Amino acid sequence: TELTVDQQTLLDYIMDSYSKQRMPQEITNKILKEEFSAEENFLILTEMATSHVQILVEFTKRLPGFQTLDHEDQIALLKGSAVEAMFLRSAEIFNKKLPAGHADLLEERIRKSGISDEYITPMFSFYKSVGELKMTQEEYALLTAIVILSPDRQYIKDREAVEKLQEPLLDVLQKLCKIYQPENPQHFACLLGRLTELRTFNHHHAEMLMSWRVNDHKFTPLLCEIWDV
Amino acid sequence: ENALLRYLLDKD
Ligand SMILES: CC[C@H]1[C@@H](O)[C@@H]2[C@H](CC[C@]3(C)[C@@H]([C@H](C)CCC(=O)O)CC[C@@H]23)[C@@]2(C)CC[C@@H](O)C[C@@H]12
């Protein structure tokens, strides 16, 4: 049950920063009330995603060292992580602890919302898989944290400067792995795995986009820019 | 040009 002071600080700071913003009540219950419609569901889901993107961009702005990085690189990392992050969040939301409320319902909206059942089946498989890992808020926070902090992102001019900030997070997730799940482990390798995994999922994602349609509705200008089009 | 994101980066 190790965990140095420098680490617990970081984890405490990150876990603080992780649960601050949160999804606005309005957009949230919007899935509980209001009803179905392949076009409505698309609007709801497409609204949220636009929100999540705002939240995320705040979290990454208050992640140790972040504002210290070259301005361009900062974009890059955000442009770079936006989807994957959402995947993790998506993961976190779905599997694990059913608060017996809206979430199980969120899946219905996704199911039949102009999204081909050929993409929601493998995707919802992946999520079930990370679910097998039985993670904790901390892991999700760190995973998201380390993912936003990837030096191997298509355009960042200075990778060393990004790593410095990434390693610490990485070292905290690792030692955090032994502790919560020592039975194996490999669990820390497995996780870094899913990271490499969702990276190819960002690939199926841009494709499935150009085929998602729904009447003729459009994507919020933000998504159009962070989901390319 | 990622103008929307930039705007969200600097004071959201
Ligand atoms: C088949 C899988 C779906 C879920 O992962 C959906 C995303 C859209 C964004 C969400 C609605 C996420 C939401 C913005 C999280 C909000 C929060 O912060 O709580 C969680 C569930 C996500 C779809 C439709 C669209 C993008 C595709 O890659 C995955 C789809």
- Which residue of A18, A23, A48, A104 sits with most ligand 1 atoms within 8 Å of its CB, as the best mutation to test the pocket? A48
Q: SS3 for B9?
A: helix
> What is the domain extent for residue A208?
1-229
CB spacing of A74 vs B9 below 8 angstroms: yes
Two tokens, residue A163: 């790593």
Number of domains forming the structure of chain A: 1
Q: What's the gap in Å between A68 CA and the centre of ligand 1?
A: 30
Measured CA to CA, the distance from residue A61 to residue A84 in angstroms comes to 17
CA A73 distance to own-chain centroid: 19
Experimental method: X-ray
Measured CA to CA, the distance from residue A45 to residue A109 in angstroms comes to 8
- Tell me if A27 sits within 8 A of A47, measured CB to CB: yes
- How is residue A117 written in tokens? 């059942």
What lies within 8 Å, CB to CB, of A163 at 6+ separation is: A151
CB-based contact A70:A155 (threshold 8 Å): no
HSE at residue A120, side-chain half, CA atoms within 13 A, is 14
Task: State CA A49 to chain mean position distance.
Answer: 11
Residue A10 CA to residue A16 CA, distance in Å, equals 10
The span from the CA of B11 to the CA of A129, in Å, is 37
Domain CATH for A116? 1.10.565.10
Please measure the distance between the N-terminal and C-terminal CA atoms of chain B and give it in whole angstroms: 17
A contact test, residue of B4, B7, B10, B12 with most A CBs within 10 A: B4
Name A100's Cβ contacts closer than 8 Å, sequence gap at least 6.
none
What is the greatest pairwise CA distance in chain A? 55
What DSSP letter does each residue of chain A carry, written as one string? ----HHHHHHHHHHHHHHTSS---HHHHHTTTSS---HHHHHHHHHHHHHHHHHHHHHHGGGSTTGGGS-HHHHHHHHHHHHHHHHHHHHHHHHSS---SSTTHHHHHHHSSSS--TTTHHHHHHHHHHHHHT---HHHHHHHHHHHHS-S-STT-S-SHHHHHHHHHHHHHHHHHHHHH--SS--HHHHHHHHHHHHHHHHHHHHHHHTT---TT----HHHHHHS--
CB A127 within 8 A of CB A91: yes
A19 burial (CB, 10 Å; 0-12 / 13-18 / 19+) is exposed
Check: CB of residue A81 under 8 Å from CB of residue A66.
no
For residue A201, the ligand 1 atom closest to its alpha carbon is: 28
**Which atom from ligand 1 is nearest to the alpha carbon of A204?**
28
Residues 6+ apart with CB under 8 A from A211: A116
A123 lines ligand 1 (CB under 6 A): yes
Q: In the A/B pair of chains, how many CB contacts fall below 8 A? A: 29
Resolution in A: 2.9
Separation CA A135–CA A190 (nearest Å): 12
What are the φ/ψ torsions at residue A216 (nearest 5 degrees)?
A: -175, 10
Residue type, A29: N
Helices (H) and strands (E) in chain B, counts: 1, 0
Exposed, middle or buried, A165 (CB in 10 Å: 0-12/13-18/19+)? buried
